[PDB]
């Protein structure tokens, strides 16, 4: 049974190493969520600092890839950082060669094509990570594009990733079935973040403090992460209505 | 930090089977149904946009791809393998042909180049075969319209009409009854939509079906005027609206 | 068991069996002793013969005018590592007009041996080395294991039955460290130490091999009738 | 010293009504010394004709090369190559040697088998295409040929008139060049017949 | 050669003559110096003719593949960057001097590229042996917010100045108009001020005038 | 490391056989039968297609019979994709010989070159061999008409009549029974089709199933012509010989 | 089964068993710690005295990178040296191009990517060391700890090796009892104590304490070893606390 | 070419002419020789236009990738990247670059990189063909910690003389102001500066 050790086909037509890379994705036990506003894209993620010795400022699964692109990862941090560094390099090289900023979806495709190569070539293992790329693209507008270990990628109106993704997905599905639009009809990003946090609270059935969340926001011409105090201001606003 | 897999991962078993190719064909079987039908004045290729989530934007996932202005491709099996094959197919059309002869390759030769790439994955060191079957529809000045199937093995066969993937056995029987050598392009599109309805469970509309044609030259889609010889791409992907129009007359 | 096929594989308890097996080749090797004072450093080596017709396998190799080693285990591997040491000692001389530090020589051997333990295809070195030298910070003695571990010591022994010599030196520590400006007495202490590892056989004239380096003493090897004095 | 004018020789090609003509002299020399009076400069690959002037070793080498390439083209495409496609192949092949070029002046002539359209083209040594309607000149007496062609030529000549015009263009040009002459060949090309004529000319 | 490009209200326009010369002689009277790169991106080429043709074709091929990969309209800055990076690599040994213009989702753009890889941004530019004749006209008449009709006039005038006054330039005028929100229109032989005058005599010879030694049929067919 | 997963394609069995060659030959034994018959005035190549579907576009299709140059053709049994790699190499070797010597490549030289390539894959490189057997039909001015076969081992031999692929045992018995040395092309055509007609696993032999080709020195004025038969022309020759 | 025989193979869990086996080698090694203080960091390590024949203060385990970063590690000692040698190459090429000395988070990733690369292929073995490292840069003090997996985080206090649980508990007390922070000289003393307390797990053999420190005020931001009177003051403090 | 960068109280100002010549022909009379490698790190380019562009593009790429990994780079870091390229490829380059940038920590900094690929940190720097004519003037008139209005005048008067005497310099005087307040572009036309 060496068809389960490397990236070759089993008799069923399955790549067991890809399937087991997907199971490594949830090893962190962290749930992420991404949604789109009018002018923005918000990504939130659970932040769990189990050790008191950890410096909580260094515990992050959100990465600033370029000025315009942000990337949240579901999976172990070494692979997350492997994928982050490569994406940064690709986003810089793109700008140099072609004279404009790498679009979100193009980066997602590029990283996916890399992930494909690990499923076909035996010496490379897949990365055990799901990469959720976010930007406000100058041509497409607010954009969510997600890559996985299989090399699959697709755009999203909103998305959720992790152990309890199905609960978050169905919560988001139901909201967009009501509103009948592809996005959160909201002017300020501040309120889109409040939505994201609120609908994760409802889906997971847990309350959050400022140090239980991690937030990334894409606007036109910059992506940035929120500090603990920025998140606190968000949580206060949620509680007050 | 070495690639030590310089030996074939696909080998002959005692019975004479190449296991990895057969298993790649099994993966193609599990894949969503796609089909191709050749008419007198065109070719049509079609497939179901099997959406992994309703939150996903299935428009962004193009199962049907332009390879050259006059050649299009669709698949069944593993989507990521297909995507990279499309990238290589587009490039090989330029490097091994257009930059030499100053014109796009004919259908059969581009197919030959794709077939070669897939064959090499079946024999080269440290790689598994591609887990897709491709259907490539195209036109060129001296061969006219044509439809080809390309398997994980690197083998390719020209078809009048065929189907691959999930419900291909039932779909091919359906195409045998309906196909003739006097079909117009619209008739083939109609038959394509009928055949594809049988293998689809859920919704059946322009948003869940991807469908393209190789037909007449489209000078409106060219983008420029002033060269009489360049008359525009024969490949055209049908819109969500254009599919739903034909579904009323179904 | 299942995890000993190559050097690249950890066992479930965190062990590298190929390295431990290379370590075993040292234990099968013939005994050799290293010890030093503040002025001089001495190697004493019991050379091994194949039979009565054969020569006794040479255990001591010179690296520079101020440094050298004795070996226990695979002699071809000692040749490789010694040759590497010679070149590093030589590089230091030519480029920097500087004699190579014994501590730094140990660091270079450690890192050379390490590369063989982390990569596929290669094997660990199957030899242990006792490096002596006199540099700008006085006398030094190093013990090299092919796991990569290099250890600066007052004295030690490696090879078969080396524990007898090593216990002796552990007792004698306070005596032999003070043997300053007296090469012969320091050699005596090494010859008495290696005698604790002998069984059945005793130290003959073509059996024994001694080397010394010190303050105004280049690294020189003594064999044959030059070591009859110390039997 | 100048490679294009060691060996000498000329090629001219003209269009007519439903026909093309291509012609060449027969001289191969080592500067002043005449060596061969049978060195033909016009070859053909199916129905496409290629004249080549310049350094004679490259003339031979490129003929062998385009035979090779067009043979493989035909085995893969399952049809003979056309003049327009071949022109591009010539250009491609010359420019890939951009910085160590073949010292030649090629001239393509032929009739497209599907459209029936007469076609001529010329190139510089690194592959730039001159796709003329009227005529193409090449070789050591190219100035002379330009002067003859530009006055003598008129469009839509019948095959047997075009023969006279291209012949007289060649002959009178070659007689004003030391390194051209020694005989001359003229191909008259129609959609499905080709006539080849050797010309009588002064042998100095 | 005489090439020019300039901008107008909602677009950019390119112009070029049609004369290619070897040494002192006229090899081509109707060559296209406006090169396709993408449907709405074009390139005027002066300098070494093969180098200018070949460089644009290569970038045009790579632009097409890039467009397919990214599913976006190509940008003029992409062409500009790819051209200059290629030309710089070869240290002017690819002697191509280009004016690149086009329309994309960013807007309309106009750039010049020199053989060594330097690039310029301008509202009106000219290159080739007739650039000084052309620039004289552009400097005397160019203004902001030109209409398309004024722009074509000025572009064709700038090229004409080269055609008449420069020996390197001649024959006809090619123009390409790239306007925002519209298909680019390529206008080969936009002006034809140098048609040859009718000849005094017809030099068609009496048949049999040429002496012939041999005749034969050539077998061009297969088998 | 990687060693764990290496099939070791290029080794001997205890018996002194090459596993992968033997298993590739087993693969080829399931492929559609190809027959080559050499006569005094030409060669015949006949071959059975494997995938009967009514929807297969037969007139533009080529799975069995390929052209190597104007003088030499091959019939294929095994993996088509593998064969097409080798074919493009053989086409190049022909043209390299033509460029060098200014003469068409002799048949045995081209065959040896390909067979040597196949041999290389069995002795070194650790890759699987080519699952292809060829029947080479050709002509040159030294030996005239020649039939050869090569198999995945890279061994090649010359033949008067030969079969590869399926039911070669039954096919070679029937050829050995009816072949004669003074035979002519028209007779060989008939023999080839009769042999396939008896050995076929199909219920009947039809035109849509066959690829057919002849090399004749019966072109205009003593040249050699390769004829790859069109579907209608195979249908005609099936009626002429009396099979349908 | 067989998923633990090769590096870079995912088990059905989604685990790389070879990396987890490298952790067992780290757990087997001697105790090492790191303490982040007000304007710097303090590193300490347990060095088991196997024999009287070991020369005191000579077999130095803590290694400097550039001039401003310290590195200590537990596990296979040679693997730790190979990683520091790499770190030095990384820190050199950074300074060569960018002039400024490598920042500590930047340096942390250069190791983190390198260690992670040794979990991607079956042709290499994972690192058999947890590495505690850090120093002072332009943004202030930083302490990191890096595992065989390539996983690393910033720390207030870090510990690894055989006495890690003991050490971690002691570090957790310091964090709770000093929220405003710990001074550099305080951290040196506490480090000595924590290594002494963590020595109950390696209690058979006696040991030798080794401490180093970067501190903006005490060392000008440079990495220096704690030597002489300051080392003896820390040993005395530690000896007093165990009794 | 006439280019200069001058540190003052609130940060730094870069100044340049706009003339590019091919021999005696002015190929471009409205050139932008002030070029952005980062938000608040710019450079002035002199020498081969092809070379200085190719360099500035590579530096921009490096600093963009630096920013993705390590946050905002110092003006010193940028000058070192410029140097590294210029020095290591000195045999194949004709580039004279003045790097100027604003940190909040360091404030305004100017680094000049002449033909050799050496680096010199200076209070102000002048470069290009036209600079030779204003060494006398700039030395006599420069002061440290000037206001923004004084620094603009100093640059304006300086490049005015440089343009007057040097044929290779001319056109408009472009300037770029770098302070905590942000990035400001200024332009000064012939009719303004010629009458000074
Ligand atoms: C005008 C350029 S100029 C004199 O610097 O203003 C023109 C530009 C041009 C012409 C044709 C095309 C068609 N693709 C594009 C651009 N260039 C020429 O006329 C050049 C001028 C030479 C470089 C001085 N001519 C050539 O390149 C010709 C080939 C032409 C006739 C196709 N080749 C040569 O002059 C030549 C000379 N020695 C060796 C090789 N080639
Ligand atoms: Cl890619
Ligand atoms: Mg003459
Ligand atoms: Mg003569």
mmCIF file with all atom_site columns, C-alpha atoms in Angstrom, chain B residues 49-173:
data_model
loop_
_atom_site.group_PDB
_atom_site.id
_atom_site.type_symbol
_atom_site.label_atom_id
_atom_site.label_alt_id
_atom_site.label_comp_id
_atom_site.label_asym_id
_atom_site.label_entity_id
_atom_site.label_seq_id
_atom_site.pdbx_PDB_ins_code
_atom_site.Cartn_x
_atom_site.Cartn_y
_atom_site.Cartn_z
_atom_site.occupancy
_atom_site.B_iso_or_equiv
_atom_site.pdbx_formal_charge
_atom_site.auth_seq_id
_atom_site.auth_comp_id
_atom_site.auth_asym_id
_atom_site.auth_atom_id
_atom_site.pdbx_PDB_model_num
ATOM 1   C CA . UNK B 1 49  ? -20.893 23.436 -13.752 1.00 0.00 ? 49  UNK B CA 1
ATOM 2   C CA . UNK B 1 50  ? -21.010 21.226 -10.636 1.00 0.00 ? 50  UNK B CA 1
ATOM 3   C CA . UNK B 1 51  ? -20.812 23.941 -7.948  1.00 0.00 ? 51  UNK B CA 1
ATOM 4   C CA . UNK B 1 52  ? -18.931 22.820 -4.763  1.00 0.00 ? 52  UNK B CA 1
ATOM 5   C CA . UNK B 1 53  ? -20.798 25.450 -2.709  1.00 0.00 ? 53  UNK B CA 1
ATOM 6   C CA . UNK B 1 54  ? -23.631 27.934 -3.441  1.00 0.00 ? 54  UNK B CA 1
ATOM 7   C CA . UNK B 1 55  ? -21.416 30.682 -1.968  1.00 0.00 ? 55  UNK B CA 1
ATOM 8   C CA . UNK B 1 56  ? -18.841 29.952 -4.710  1.00 0.00 ? 56  UNK B CA 1
ATOM 9   C CA . UNK B 1 57  ? -19.047 32.045 -7.904  1.00 0.00 ? 57  UNK B CA 1
ATOM 10  C CA . UNK B 1 58  ? -19.137 29.308 -10.580 1.00 0.00 ? 58  UNK B CA 1
ATOM 11  C CA . UNK B 1 59  ? -18.638 31.896 -13.363 1.00 0.00 ? 59  UNK B CA 1
ATOM 12  C CA . UNK B 1 60  ? -15.042 32.240 -12.136 1.00 0.00 ? 60  UNK B CA 1
ATOM 13  C CA . UNK B 1 61  ? -14.516 28.478 -12.645 1.00 0.00 ? 61  UNK B CA 1
ATOM 14  C CA . UNK B 1 62  ? -14.201 28.005 -16.429 1.00 0.00 ? 62  UNK B CA 1
ATOM 15  C CA . UNK B 1 63  ? -14.489 24.306 -17.285 1.00 0.00 ? 63  UNK B CA 1
ATOM 16  C CA . UNK B 1 64  ? -14.629 25.278 -20.992 1.00 0.00 ? 64  UNK B CA 1
ATOM 17  C CA . UNK B 1 65  ? -11.470 27.060 -22.151 1.00 0.00 ? 65  UNK B CA 1
ATOM 18  C CA . UNK B 1 66  ? -10.216 28.865 -25.270 1.00 0.00 ? 66  UNK B CA 1
ATOM 19  C CA . UNK B 1 67  ? -6.901  27.332 -26.430 1.00 0.00 ? 67  UNK B CA 1
ATOM 20  C CA . UNK B 1 68  ? -6.547  29.302 -29.694 1.00 0.00 ? 68  UNK B CA 1
ATOM 21  C CA . UNK B 1 69  ? -9.091  31.613 -31.379 1.00 0.00 ? 69  UNK B CA 1
ATOM 22  C CA . UNK B 1 70  ? -10.350 28.575 -33.384 1.00 0.00 ? 70  UNK B CA 1
ATOM 23  C CA . UNK B 1 71  ? -9.880  25.765 -30.751 1.00 0.00 ? 71  UNK B CA 1
ATOM 24  C CA . UNK B 1 72  ? -11.719 25.071 -27.477 1.00 0.00 ? 72  UNK B CA 1
ATOM 25  C CA . UNK B 1 73  ? -11.446 22.430 -24.756 1.00 0.00 ? 73  UNK B CA 1
ATOM 26  C CA . UNK B 1 74  ? -13.583 20.869 -22.030 1.00 0.00 ? 74  UNK B CA 1
ATOM 27  C CA . UNK B 1 75  ? -12.865 18.003 -19.599 1.00 0.00 ? 75  UNK B CA 1
ATOM 28  C CA . UNK B 1 76  ? -14.003 15.368 -17.146 1.00 0.00 ? 76  UNK B CA 1
ATOM 29  C CA . UNK B 1 77  ? -12.023 14.360 -14.038 1.00 0.00 ? 77  UNK B CA 1
ATOM 30  C CA . UNK B 1 78  ? -9.609  16.402 -11.923 1.00 0.00 ? 78  UNK B CA 1
ATOM 31  C CA . UNK B 1 79  ? -10.056 20.150 -12.533 1.00 0.00 ? 79  UNK B CA 1
ATOM 32  C CA . UNK B 1 80  ? -6.552  21.246 -11.367 1.00 0.00 ? 80  UNK B CA 1
ATOM 33  C CA . UNK B 1 81  ? -4.844  18.870 -13.853 1.00 0.00 ? 81  UNK B CA 1
ATOM 34  C CA . UNK B 1 82  ? -7.048  20.352 -16.601 1.00 0.00 ? 82  UNK B CA 1
ATOM 35  C CA . UNK B 1 83  ? -6.199  23.944 -15.698 1.00 0.00 ? 83  UNK B CA 1
ATOM 36  C CA . UNK B 1 84  ? -2.446  23.358 -15.994 1.00 0.00 ? 84  UNK B CA 1
ATOM 37  C CA . UNK B 1 85  ? -2.920  21.391 -19.238 1.00 0.00 ? 85  UNK B CA 1
ATOM 38  C CA . UNK B 1 86  ? -4.797  24.411 -20.681 1.00 0.00 ? 86  UNK B CA 1
ATOM 39  C CA . UNK B 1 87  ? -1.905  26.695 -19.671 1.00 0.00 ? 87  UNK B CA 1
ATOM 40  C CA . UNK B 1 88  ? 0.649   24.394 -21.426 1.00 0.00 ? 88  UNK B CA 1
ATOM 41  C CA . UNK B 1 89  ? -1.632  23.876 -24.439 1.00 0.00 ? 89  UNK B CA 1
ATOM 42  C CA . UNK B 1 90  ? -1.931  27.637 -24.967 1.00 0.00 ? 90  UNK B CA 1
ATOM 43  C CA . UNK B 1 91  ? 1.815   28.138 -24.675 1.00 0.00 ? 91  UNK B CA 1
ATOM 44  C CA . UNK B 1 92  ? 2.775   25.164 -26.896 1.00 0.00 ? 92  UNK B CA 1
ATOM 45  C CA . UNK B 1 93  ? 0.468   26.584 -29.607 1.00 0.00 ? 93  UNK B CA 1
ATOM 46  C CA . UNK B 1 94  ? 2.752   29.659 -29.676 1.00 0.00 ? 94  UNK B CA 1
ATOM 47  C CA . UNK B 1 95  ? 6.217   28.182 -29.034 1.00 0.00 ? 95  UNK B CA 1
ATOM 48  C CA . UNK B 1 96  ? 6.095   25.088 -31.226 1.00 0.00 ? 96  UNK B CA 1
ATOM 49  C CA . UNK B 1 97  ? 3.885   26.635 -33.952 1.00 0.00 ? 97  UNK B CA 1
ATOM 50  C CA . UNK B 1 98  ? 2.775   30.316 -34.112 1.00 0.00 ? 98  UNK B CA 1
ATOM 51  C CA . UNK B 1 99  ? 6.282   31.729 -33.591 1.00 0.00 ? 99  UNK B CA 1
ATOM 52  C CA . UNK B 1 100 ? 7.552   29.455 -36.412 1.00 0.00 ? 100 UNK B CA 1
ATOM 53  C CA . UNK B 1 101 ? 4.769   29.605 -39.043 1.00 0.00 ? 101 UNK B CA 1
ATOM 54  C CA . UNK B 1 102 ? 3.025   32.915 -38.172 1.00 0.00 ? 102 UNK B CA 1
ATOM 55  C CA . UNK B 1 103 ? -0.395  31.233 -37.795 1.00 0.00 ? 103 UNK B CA 1
ATOM 56  C CA . UNK B 1 104 ? -2.246  29.141 -35.162 1.00 0.00 ? 104 UNK B CA 1
ATOM 57  C CA . UNK B 1 105 ? -1.828  25.348 -35.293 1.00 0.00 ? 105 UNK B CA 1
ATOM 58  C CA . UNK B 1 106 ? -4.542  23.126 -36.765 1.00 0.00 ? 106 UNK B CA 1
ATOM 59  C CA . UNK B 1 107 ? -6.774  21.198 -34.344 1.00 0.00 ? 107 UNK B CA 1
ATOM 60  C CA . UNK B 1 108 ? -5.156  17.738 -34.778 1.00 0.00 ? 108 UNK B CA 1
ATOM 61  C CA . UNK B 1 109 ? -1.592  19.055 -34.239 1.00 0.00 ? 109 UNK B CA 1
ATOM 62  C CA . UNK B 1 110 ? -2.442  21.029 -31.103 1.00 0.00 ? 110 UNK B CA 1
ATOM 63  C CA . UNK B 1 111 ? -4.234  17.879 -29.894 1.00 0.00 ? 111 UNK B CA 1
ATOM 64  C CA . UNK B 1 112 ? -1.069  15.952 -30.778 1.00 0.00 ? 112 UNK B CA 1
ATOM 65  C CA . UNK B 1 113 ? 0.998   18.336 -28.581 1.00 0.00 ? 113 UNK B CA 1
ATOM 66  C CA . UNK B 1 114 ? -1.419  17.976 -25.626 1.00 0.00 ? 114 UNK B CA 1
ATOM 67  C CA . UNK B 1 115 ? -1.425  14.209 -26.125 1.00 0.00 ? 115 UNK B CA 1
ATOM 68  C CA . UNK B 1 116 ? 2.378   14.277 -26.033 1.00 0.00 ? 116 UNK B CA 1
ATOM 69  C CA . UNK B 1 117 ? 2.410   16.165 -22.713 1.00 0.00 ? 117 UNK B CA 1
ATOM 70  C CA . UNK B 1 118 ? 0.003   13.622 -21.187 1.00 0.00 ? 118 UNK B CA 1
ATOM 71  C CA . UNK B 1 119 ? 1.985   10.663 -22.580 1.00 0.00 ? 119 UNK B CA 1
ATOM 72  C CA . UNK B 1 120 ? 5.153   12.003 -20.971 1.00 0.00 ? 120 UNK B CA 1
ATOM 73  C CA . UNK B 1 121 ? 3.384   11.988 -17.534 1.00 0.00 ? 121 UNK B CA 1
ATOM 74  C CA . UNK B 1 122 ? 2.728   8.295  -18.193 1.00 0.00 ? 122 UNK B CA 1
ATOM 75  C CA . UNK B 1 123 ? 6.464   7.456  -18.739 1.00 0.00 ? 123 UNK B CA 1
ATOM 76  C CA . UNK B 1 124 ? 8.683   10.247 -17.274 1.00 0.00 ? 124 UNK B CA 1
ATOM 77  C CA . UNK B 1 125 ? 10.310  9.991  -13.880 1.00 0.00 ? 125 UNK B CA 1
ATOM 78  C CA . UNK B 1 126 ? 8.509   10.863 -10.647 1.00 0.00 ? 126 UNK B CA 1
ATOM 79  C CA . UNK B 1 127 ? 5.073   11.795 -11.988 1.00 0.00 ? 127 UNK B CA 1
ATOM 80  C CA . UNK B 1 128 ? 1.596   10.340 -12.078 1.00 0.00 ? 128 UNK B CA 1
ATOM 81  C CA . UNK B 1 129 ? -0.521  10.534 -15.230 1.00 0.00 ? 129 UNK B CA 1
ATOM 82  C CA . UNK B 1 130 ? -2.979  13.391 -15.680 1.00 0.00 ? 130 UNK B CA 1
ATOM 83  C CA . UNK B 1 131 ? -6.383  12.421 -14.202 1.00 0.00 ? 131 UNK B CA 1
ATOM 84  C CA . UNK B 1 132 ? -8.475  13.961 -16.990 1.00 0.00 ? 132 UNK B CA 1
ATOM 85  C CA . UNK B 1 133 ? -9.950  13.159 -20.342 1.00 0.00 ? 133 UNK B CA 1
ATOM 86  C CA . UNK B 1 134 ? -10.088 16.190 -22.634 1.00 0.00 ? 134 UNK B CA 1
ATOM 87  C CA . UNK B 1 135 ? -12.533 16.915 -25.406 1.00 0.00 ? 135 UNK B CA 1
ATOM 88  C CA . UNK B 1 136 ? -10.969 19.399 -27.849 1.00 0.00 ? 136 UNK B CA 1
ATOM 89  C CA . UNK B 1 137 ? -13.172 20.965 -30.539 1.00 0.00 ? 137 UNK B CA 1
ATOM 90  C CA . UNK B 1 138 ? -11.650 23.104 -33.255 1.00 0.00 ? 138 UNK B CA 1
ATOM 91  C CA . UNK B 1 139 ? -11.505 24.430 -36.810 1.00 0.00 ? 139 UNK B CA 1
ATOM 92  C CA . UNK B 1 140 ? -8.725  25.138 -39.286 1.00 0.00 ? 140 UNK B CA 1
ATOM 93  C CA . UNK B 1 141 ? -8.688  26.129 -42.958 1.00 0.00 ? 141 UNK B CA 1
ATOM 94  C CA . UNK B 1 142 ? -7.542  22.777 -44.473 1.00 0.00 ? 142 UNK B CA 1
ATOM 95  C CA . UNK B 1 143 ? -9.148  20.170 -42.117 1.00 0.00 ? 143 UNK B CA 1
ATOM 96  C CA . UNK B 1 144 ? -12.406 22.033 -41.392 1.00 0.00 ? 144 UNK B CA 1
ATOM 97  C CA . UNK B 1 145 ? -14.268 21.303 -38.176 1.00 0.00 ? 145 UNK B CA 1
ATOM 98  C CA . UNK B 1 146 ? -13.130 18.512 -35.853 1.00 0.00 ? 146 UNK B CA 1
ATOM 99  C CA . UNK B 1 147 ? -13.642 17.030 -32.379 1.00 0.00 ? 147 UNK B CA 1
ATOM 100 C CA . UNK B 1 148 ? -10.991 15.008 -30.520 1.00 0.00 ? 148 UNK B CA 1
ATOM 101 C CA . UNK B 1 149 ? -10.900 13.108 -27.224 1.00 0.00 ? 149 UNK B CA 1
ATOM 102 C CA . UNK B 1 150 ? -7.600  12.853 -25.298 1.00 0.00 ? 150 UNK B CA 1
ATOM 103 C CA . UNK B 1 151 ? -7.141  10.227 -22.545 1.00 0.00 ? 151 UNK B CA 1
ATOM 104 C CA . UNK B 1 152 ? -4.690  9.983  -19.577 1.00 0.00 ? 152 UNK B CA 1
ATOM 105 C CA . UNK B 1 153 ? -2.612  7.538  -21.659 1.00 0.00 ? 153 UNK B CA 1
ATOM 106 C CA . UNK B 1 154 ? -1.897  10.235 -24.286 1.00 0.00 ? 154 UNK B CA 1
ATOM 107 C CA . UNK B 1 155 ? -4.105  8.426  -26.790 1.00 0.00 ? 155 UNK B CA 1
ATOM 108 C CA . UNK B 1 156 ? -6.437  10.550 -28.911 1.00 0.00 ? 156 UNK B CA 1
ATOM 109 C CA . UNK B 1 157 ? -9.294  9.685  -31.264 1.00 0.00 ? 157 UNK B CA 1
ATOM 110 C CA . UNK B 1 158 ? -11.415 11.926 -33.507 1.00 0.00 ? 158 UNK B CA 1
ATOM 111 C CA . UNK B 1 159 ? -15.172 11.806 -32.792 1.00 0.00 ? 159 UNK B CA 1
ATOM 112 C CA . UNK B 1 160 ? -18.373 12.816 -34.565 1.00 0.00 ? 160 UNK B CA 1
ATOM 113 C CA . UNK B 1 161 ? -19.915 12.987 -31.105 1.00 0.00 ? 161 UNK B CA 1
ATOM 114 C CA . UNK B 1 162 ? -19.004 11.583 -27.697 1.00 0.00 ? 162 UNK B CA 1
ATOM 115 C CA . UNK B 1 163 ? -19.246 11.908 -23.930 1.00 0.00 ? 163 UNK B CA 1
ATOM 116 C CA . UNK B 1 164 ? -16.846 11.273 -21.054 1.00 0.00 ? 164 UNK B CA 1
ATOM 117 C CA . UNK B 1 165 ? -17.126 10.950 -17.300 1.00 0.00 ? 165 UNK B CA 1
ATOM 118 C CA . UNK B 1 166 ? -20.068 10.088 -15.032 1.00 0.00 ? 166 UNK B CA 1
ATOM 119 C CA . UNK B 1 167 ? -22.964 9.177  -17.369 1.00 0.00 ? 167 UNK B CA 1
ATOM 120 C CA . UNK B 1 168 ? -20.904 8.648  -20.543 1.00 0.00 ? 168 UNK B CA 1
ATOM 121 C CA . UNK B 1 169 ? -22.205 5.119  -21.287 1.00 0.00 ? 169 UNK B CA 1
ATOM 122 C CA . UNK B 1 170 ? -25.851 6.296  -21.255 1.00 0.00 ? 170 UNK B CA 1
ATOM 123 C CA . UNK B 1 171 ? -24.957 9.608  -22.985 1.00 0.00 ? 171 UNK B CA 1
ATOM 124 C CA . UNK B 1 172 ? -23.064 7.915  -25.867 1.00 0.00 ? 172 UNK B CA 1
ATOM 125 C CA . UNK B 1 173 ? -26.081 5.628  -26.527 1.00 0.00 ? 173 UNK B CA 1
#
